[model samples]
Target: NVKAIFLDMDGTILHENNQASTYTKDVINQLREKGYKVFLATGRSHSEIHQLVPQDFAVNGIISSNGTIGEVDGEIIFKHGLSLAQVQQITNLAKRQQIYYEVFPFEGNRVSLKEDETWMRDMIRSQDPINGVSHSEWSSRQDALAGKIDWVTKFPEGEYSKIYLFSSNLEKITAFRDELKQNHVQLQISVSNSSRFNAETMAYQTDKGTGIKEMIAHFGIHQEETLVIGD
Candidate 1:
């Protein structure tokens, strides 16, 4: 039997409209009824979990923020933060490149620099879903564009779970990565999205892998017994 099922949200379970299909929900529920554990493992924040999934659909637990945070069975498993200096340092560099970014803290609202707020806001305006996305997809981007991400001229003096950098231009992302390497930065980065415009960067030695470790141990699920799924 599968000890646990780890799933991703965007591009994996959610449609371009950002809504899960009805059949998907029903299947997961049926599995639960048959006594299986289904968990969400994604790059979203813990606070964003409820907004991403339907109220009627259910999962046993969530692993969020690219593995910087985790929870299972309503109990805290682990939470980690990147060094403020590194976050600040990287934030400064990303700004120099005028890269649109959202720095996610351990809690509370995610923030973007005010100097770039208009740029960030403008990026979403004409594009709507920004990818000619469906009505639901455009609707999903609505809240964040309106203000889910806090805008500030000055980054708060705090640590962060990760930095979300987005752009419609894939080359910009490639250039940014090249620059990071050229600059000798040691930060760990992952570009799970095929769009090329999106990338998520976490602190060193962290990602879904770390989150999986905590979950397997929490439930005593053997490593080999686990199944991982994502787009």
Candidate 2:
């Protein structure tokens, strides 16, 4: 009776380790073949999802960046993004705390401070043994640098899509979340522990639920017609 199925990427469709399971993939394919619109609902970015799913995967749409951005059949259907002022404010706080973070611009790519990159690589080395790569290997492909911005002095002119922070200590992430909430109630932050040791934050009002609702409305689909099947 459902017209669509919304599948969470990490933990639901993709395994906890961030790898897609064959069984889950097969089931999704079967469902899609049966005429159900399958959508990937994830905290990951559009670029990230593109690399994971097959080019011909029967997915009907994707809600990326925890709902800040959404696309259907390669066409952007709905999109919401952070403001430069908010990004600057958050980045300033992160710098003061020496916390590692990556800022994803709505129009361009993601950026991370050099120190954060180094610290995160070291943390990954000490923790994720099975899939850990060298610091050089990880940063070589991305724009990682130090003193990248002084949010207090200048704000980015571009649209901010998502802000991602990584910490080896769960307590630190929890504290940071609390601090953000206490200070910035207006900011829409989506926190998901897709990884056991890592926590991510996105725009507050944006999430799989909100993104899916927008997408369903765009497609003229009713909420009752959505099945949302996933493992």
Q: Best-fitting candidate, measured by TM-score?
A: 1
For candidate 2, what is the TM-score?
A: 0.70
Candidate 2 wrongly placed segments (more than 4 Å):
11-29, 106-109, 115-156, 169-171, 188-199
| Best-matching candidate per lDDT | 1
Model 1 clash pairs are: 114-152
Question: Model 1 over residues 1-231: C-alpha lDDT tens digits?
Answer: 687777765633553453355766776798789787777765466666555555666777777737777876667788766766777777777778777777888667888777777776766676455553355544544667686778777777766788776665557877876666555345544333334565556666677788877877787887677787762
lDDT of 2 by residue, 1-231 (tens): 689888865633453433455665777799888988888776455665665565566777877736777878879887677777778778767767666677876544466554455554554453223334344323422323323322222445866667776555666766776777665556556555444333455666566678878887777888899866443
**lDDT of each candidate versus the true structure:** 0.67, 0.63
Native-structure RMSD, model 1: 4.3
The TM-scores of all predictions, comma-separated, are 0.74, 0.70
